[PDB]
Design a protein around this ligand. Sequence first.
Ligand code: ATP
Ligand code: MG
Lengths: 52, 256
Amino acid sequence: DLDLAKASATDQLKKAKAEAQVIIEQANKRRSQILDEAKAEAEQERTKIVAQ
Amino acid sequence: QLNSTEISELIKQRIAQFNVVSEAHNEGTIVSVSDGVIRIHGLADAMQGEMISLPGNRYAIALNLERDSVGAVVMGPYADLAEGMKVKATGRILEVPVGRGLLGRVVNTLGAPIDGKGPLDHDGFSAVEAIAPGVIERQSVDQPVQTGYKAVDSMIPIGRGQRELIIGDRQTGKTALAIDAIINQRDSGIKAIYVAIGQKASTISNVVRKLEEHGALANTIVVVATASESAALQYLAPYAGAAMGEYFRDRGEDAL
Ligand SMILES: Nc1ncnc2c1ncn2[C@@H]1O[C@H](COP(=O)(O)OP(=O)(O)OP(=O)(O)O)[C@@H](O)[C@H]1O
Ligand SMILES: [Mg+2]
């Protein structure tokens, strides 16, 4: 159970590093969504202002 | 394109419209003046609620027909008057212009335009004092009036033809809620009217500017009586505003 415990602890440690990365990846994607919708709303607003 | 020739043609057309032959009129004299109230001697042919024309372009309303005098109120600055000035009687009962050509204009309670846009186009006149349609002529309200806000469309819904009082203390958002209601009818096919009684003038200009900023102004009539103007004008402001709204009601359209 020393051999088992060392191997299993490493598998757990691997897992946490991986899942931290996938959270950060998804966060950058959500950032990109927010910013692209920011560009979209910027343009829409300008189209209103010129008519005024 | 601004064009001089079309203006010249219009002036000539006004000369053609003028009729030189005169008409007999009943006349009277101002006897006493105070605080916008007037006492007039003469006008044997006057009727209660009539519009009396004073010197200049100002008018007055006949309130009391006493035995030997008429009690009246000036619809403007009264300080320029003096006992003895002749006043003529227009048989017209108090009236104001009406029509769909008024949309997008800022107008005094006497129907005169206050904006710099120019003279006004109207589909005749409607009377300021009138009695509303009777019990048999009414119909149940069955259609929504979608204002912008979540709360009042969900909890306190308003139907076309309903009367709903926005009540609260000063600086609580009453004005904002009302004009956001106007602005959301911009596309719903409901005509809008805004009557400002006694507000500070700067407010009214800022409100019209915000209505223009969202493109709702082309769907609104705005009636103005500033805090500076004579009390009679304020008192009659909502009645004039009501007289304009009835035009759309009676032609089968919806108005707010
Ligand atoms: N939805 C809102 N969110 C935040 N502030 C708002 C909102 N609606 C209105 N206000 C604010 O309320 C304040 C007063 O608005 P408003 O002029 O409509 O009030 P009022 O009670 O009608 O005022 P008054 O009695 O002076 O006419 C303004 O500062 C405005 O920004
Ligand atoms: Mg207000």
